[PDB]
Amino acid sequence: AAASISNLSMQTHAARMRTFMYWPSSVPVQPEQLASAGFYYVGRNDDVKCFCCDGGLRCWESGDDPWVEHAKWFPRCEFLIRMKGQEFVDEIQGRYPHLLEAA
Numbered sequence: 001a002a003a004s005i006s007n008l009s010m011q012t013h014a015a016r017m018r019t020f021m022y023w024p025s026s027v028p029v030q031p032e033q034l035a036s037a038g039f040y041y042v043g044r045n046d047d048v049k050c051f052c053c054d055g056g057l058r059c060w061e062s063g064d065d066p067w068v069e070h071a072k073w074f075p076r077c078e079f080l081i082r083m084k085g086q087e088f089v090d091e092i093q094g095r096y097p098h099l100l101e102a103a
Ligand SMILES: CC[C@H](NC(=O)[C@H](C)NC)C(=O)N1C[C@@H](O)C[C@H]1Cc1c(-c2[nH]c3cc(F)ccc3c2C[C@@H]2C[C@H](O)CN2C(=O)[C@@H](CC)NC(=O)[C@H](C)NC)[nH]c2cc(F)ccc12
Pocket: 042, 047, 048, 049, 056, 057, 058, 059, 060, 061, 064, 069, 073
């Protein structure tokens, strides 16, 4: 069974892509990578949200993988779990935050 979707209007990849009209060229993550991972542009800075879980992410850095960030921050997202599988999410959740030594 499928649970709630926060934003039905953005459930399609094409709809999410259309939001990235004014995506800043300086950001080292591309609209297609974001849209594929469920994200659409909110229209300010580099803020995006997931159509399913309504999780917002910003301050995208060089080397960021939207699927990994999705799983790092919103592991309970149903779209994420169905697209990537629970094992992907669990792996990401076991990996981050990186271990710091001392206790
Ligand atoms: C940087 C780490 C993280 N980014 C990354 O890891 C990137 C990929 N890779 C390195 C990130 O973006 N996060 C981590 C989570 O925390 C959620 C998100 C930050 C965020 C919060 C987000 N997540 C939180 C977690 C908390 F425990 C406390 C507050 C927050 C917030 C709100 C932040 C903190 C403070 O409230 C001000 N604030 C704002 O968004 C202010 C900015 C003017 N503006 C507003 O409120 C407007 C009007 N409404 C939202 N709200 C958002 C809304 C968005 F559309 C986009 C991102 C956010």
